[model samples]
Structure formats: structure tokens, C-alpha cells
Target: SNADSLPERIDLFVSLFDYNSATTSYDIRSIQTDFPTRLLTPDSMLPQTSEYPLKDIQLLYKLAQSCTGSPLITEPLVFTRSLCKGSSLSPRWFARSGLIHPGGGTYAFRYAEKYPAQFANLLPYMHIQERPNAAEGTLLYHLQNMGEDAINALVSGASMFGSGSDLWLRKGDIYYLFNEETWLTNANKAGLSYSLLSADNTCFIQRGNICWDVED
Candidate 1:
């Protein structure tokens, strides 16, 4: 609630799981990136899913944070100056995913335009990221790269068909955070499985599947 004050500190929990390693990597030699369009049918699974079994998982968070009661830092404000000078309409990174472009400017502008009343109602809780740079450890960089339409689509899909999960795409990896109640409600329908280390814990896990190559 808006009347409630911020917590003094945050508690985080973590878990780990282990499994046997495979001798050989998934056989992807059969897959070709530059296959001719006429030869590649619509039903083709261009990059096939690996048959690898799930293994270990780990999680962490920043702790030992402190804040003041003087609401100045947390207070919401309106922009006195125009802040959309260099925003792009067709974000290039999003085009790489073959997804359609959504309206754009700033994240706030897109959100306000797409969901005005909800945006207004949730204004107090709103935290936006601007001038996103992944090298600086910003989640907004990935989300912005996903473009406005995909973000809206994921949110709407979460509200209807998902566990009310919000997405974060980091370094080509997707992360979804779900409210506890909704997470449990829709767990079965989720393609990936999850695990909770403790009954009271709010955090859970969905082990990774994609094997990303690290460039030197």
C-alpha cells in the first residue's frame, strides 16, 4: 500500500541442484543457419531443442541495503523538460527476434500510452530505467531491446494465460517473476518446472535450457 513504509532490509534465499554431465554436446551439425528459404519448410524446427537433462541451479541477490524515512527519494514526480530526444520507433535488437515492433519513445511514454489507467494507479510503485546500458548491469537494457510490443504481449499473456509473471530477458536468457499465489495457481501450465527450498520462501527456480556460447 502507498501508506506503508519501505522495509529496512531484504531477505534472500537460494538453492542448488546437481546432475551428471553428458559426454558430448547436443548434435547441432544437422542444423544450418543459412539454409535456403524454399528448402526450409514452415514446420521446421530450425534450431532443435537439446535432449540434455536438467542439472544445477543457483541464485543470489543484493542484501544489506538501507534507506531513509524521508520520502523525498521515493516520491513520484512529473517531467518539466521533454525527455524523448533520442528514442527509436523501430528498435533494432527486437527485429532480430522476428517479432513485430510496438510503439516507442521512452518506456514511460509507451506504458502510459498502452495502459494509462493502470499506469496511473500503479504510478507510486513504478520504477523505470532510462539510458539503459547492459555493461552497467541494467535489466531495462534487455527489456527495451525486446521492444515495447513484446513486453506488452508478455504482460497481457501473463494476466490471462500465465501465472501473472513479468519477464526479464538478460544476455539472451529469459527470467520470469511471479506472485506466489499466482505462481502456484498456474504452475502446472508452465512449460518449465520450478522448485522452492522452503515453504515460506517467495523465490523459486526454473532451470536454464539454452546453451549460450561465451565469446572471448
Candidate 2:
């Protein structure tokens, strides 16, 4: 419904099975500037039957994208980073492993252009220690400059797909929400998503998890 007045709070539930300890560590490693990607790939036998479907992933992406820090995260790297259990090459794991995929847009490009330094910093966060080359840094920058195309890309890309459309990304139990005080509140968004996914399964987003949704 994308209703603005949905209750302020909603129950959130995230399935625990999908939490890969390695990937969880990878999240930290990625921030360490020492993370390895050359030999990365999912090492699990988990099926693609999601309690929540592709729409859930899309909604989450949309909500998160809406959030812009003073120098907001412009690159899609972090978003893709968290989404993929391993690798960000065309986000293959999304469609291949039955996970939702991101819509192609100019957010990454825009970030690269407007906030080159901001983008460069993320590489180190991902555990890449090498100093960012001009070309490499440019590649990392995106969505830093605010523009109509970027805004449109954001709106269109975020909503182009609907829930349950991508079966591969379905992970059984999905939740989605947005911050209210600013653009969308994480707590509000995750809470709503949790309640919905919990309807049939037990997937949820909590407070402690990395980038865990929190009411602000």
C-alpha cells in the first residue's frame, strides 16, 4: 500500500537460517579494508524458497535508498554488499540463488560523480586497503550529486518490481519499512516488514544486526 499513515510500530521477524556466519563476518571484513573477494561464493546448500518474495527485497532497497545522510551513501556497493551473501558481480546470487535483484539505475554513477571521496572511503570499509585510484574511485562514486534523473531513477527502480515476483530471492519471511522523521525510519520500515513476513513465517530485522532498522 505504501501508506504513509500506517501504524508507527509493527512487529518484525527475520528468519535466522539465512544468516551465514561467514557472510556475517564478511560484513565486518568488508568494512575492514582487508576483505577478500577473489575467491568468494556462497558455500551453502540453502534452498530458494523464501517466506517472503522478491518484492520484499525491492521494498527494502527502496526504503533504504530513500535515506540520505548529509553526505548520504550514494554508491550501491553497500546495498549490494549486504544483499549478496557473496560477490557483487551483476548481483548474480540474487537471481541465481533466488534472491531479489536490484534494478539497474544511475544511483551508483551519480554517487560516483558527486561524492568521489565518500565513495572512495567505502572501498576501505569493504576491506580493500589499496589507495583509491582515480579510475577506481570514480567507479565507486555514485548518487552524490542530487539530480532529477537520479531521483527518478530512485523512484522508478525502487518500484518497478513488485512483491513475490522473484521466487529465487524469496527467503521465507520478509519485512519492509522506511524512516519517518527524515525520509524513512529504519525501525518503522523493519517493524512493518517483520509483521508481514511473520504472517506466514519467522523472518525479521532486529536492532543489533548490522544496519539493523532502528527508530530515529
TM-score result, candidate 1: 0.18
lDDT of 1 by residue, 78-189 (tens): 1111112322222232223222111112234333444454445432122233222345233333333433344443333322112113322111122333244434433333
Q: Can you tell me which runs of candidate 2 are displaced by over 4 Å? A: 1-33, 36-39, 42-52, 64-114, 127-216
TM-score of each: 0.18, 0.19
Q: Report the lDDT tens digits of candidate 2 across residue range 150-179.
A: 223222333211122111111222212111
Quote the RMSD, in angstroms, for model 2.
Answer: 22.2
Q: Which stretches of candidate 1 lie over 4 Å from their true place?
A: 1-129, 136-138, 157-216
State the local distance difference test value for candidate 2: 0.29
Worst lDDT window (10 residues) for model 2?
A: 160-169
Residue pairs with clashing backbones, model 1: none
| Model 1 CA lDDT for position 199 | 44
> TM-score for model 2?
0.19
Give each model's whole-structure lDDT: 0.26, 0.29
